[PDB]
Symmetry: D2
Subunit: 29 residues, 4 copies
């Protein structure tokens, strides 16, 4: 688990970070 | 543009799809 | 596990699919 | 454009970062 919950942490951040870049793209475009 | 807005469409879907898989992972884990 | 390996499957596909949309964006842009 | 190529930069990094977290998950799991 302890390794798994650290992957989950990094996935949460990657996912938030993609959603902010996609919102920025969508108003650029 | 017309090519750009189709990339934006696919990014929106990829991003939603990642958020649902991450929510599922986070309650599995 | 069986639930975990199905999340892993979906993540693999989401990740491939993002890499193809990013390659397409990068040559559009 | 200059705004677009900065989105592209951030997408490249998000995509690399997801692929490393997915590779780590897949060998955890
Ligand atoms: Na932590
Ligand atoms: Na940003
Ligand atoms: Na459409
Ligand atoms: Na799903
Ligand atoms: Na399968
Ligand atoms: Na595509
Ligand atoms: Na730069
Ligand atoms: Na990492």
């Amino acid at each position: 688990v302890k390794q798994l919950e650290d992957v989950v942490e990094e996935l949460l951040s990657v996912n938030y970070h993609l959603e902010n870049v996609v919102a920025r793209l969508k108003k650029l475009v």
